[PDB]
Symmetry: C4
Subunit: 110 residues, 4 copies
């Protein structure tokens, strides 16, 4: 009874079990909202978003831990987290310190 | 509105026709891309770097142009130039980083 | 010999059956992978991170296990553990880097 | 008369004009050697190599400049360059300094 759904992000296809996405409701991917992005004549959801950051988002559902890839711009990252309804307070202790510095450095810009 | 396929060196990107249209005058938001459009495969083809194209494509989605820290500033500029996008529009979130790498480059 | 498809979260990797066989005892070089093998799509499926899998797969091709600098040391270890590969086998080219990031992590 | 060939690297498909690859003969990709990796019942060359580094290799043929992605291990990088028959002396002046430091740092290891 487990579906293997396809998440077409910007052309990049990601697959995960419907189960994995349901572990976290209230977020866009684990709550009916995602039905808003679905082409029935392809049988897949399409997201006109960044495919690179989505990997961290998806890895979150499957591990519970949200990491911060230090090659990514803190703004791009936050932008996507916002869209997916994931709160950056969920950032694992393993990545928090780095997220904290990058966020602070960003805040002191002009 | 509909999905268009942007094949960049074999890596296929998809977006909404209207996403690109948010910025005319630039290669992609123009009819200029139409010269890269293949009629048989029905997808646009670009013999360019697919990673910087990712950043260019994202600029159209968010209005923010980011500079991938891991990329060579030189390769980044060449690519930007091709898409008719000025480095000047790089976001404030990445400008500091961009200008530093460009400085270390000229030396 | 023949090509096998390793679908990792939708990202499909291909390699030679003999490439994986270079390391028995580990999940992939074993028959253990066979439990992830789907019979209808005829490809192995892994609900894991496709980027670290890239590094794991490369270890089979070159005998060298590299540590992607941009990856979280924690996410890297969890993944390594799943594939039955010991961080101890990380190459000398990446060990220095690996151990430093692991040190900064525990603190 | 220009072919669009497919380079299946580790499952990642790359496409470039036969023309682009010919700009640099003597290298594995621009010299008959590559015929050694070809499945006629797929009409594409397959390389059981790293897909990430191949992007720099391919960008080389199309621009003449060989860059060094600073997120990559210098050994992995050299390993691939060797396989593709590309000499690291071709590294653009834009990336040489960084390649030089990473190579030196590697040389002082144990
Ligand atoms: Zn982490
Ligand atoms: Zn930015
Ligand atoms: Zn290494
Ligand atoms: Zn460069």
């Amino acid at each position: 009874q487990d579906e293997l759904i396809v998440l077409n992000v910007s052309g990049r296809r990601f697959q995960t079990w419907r189960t994995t996405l349901e572990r976290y409701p209230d977020t866009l991917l684990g709550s009916t909202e995602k039905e808003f992005f679905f082409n029935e004549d392809t049988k897949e959801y399409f997201f006109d978003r960044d495919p690179e950051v989505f990997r961290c988002v998806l890895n979150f559902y499957r591990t519970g831990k949200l990491h911060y890839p230090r090659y990514e711009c803190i703004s791009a990252y936050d932008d996507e987290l916002a869209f997916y309804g994931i709160l950056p307070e969920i950032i694992g202790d393993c990545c928090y310190e780095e997220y904290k510095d990058r966020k602070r450095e960003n805040l002191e810009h002009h």
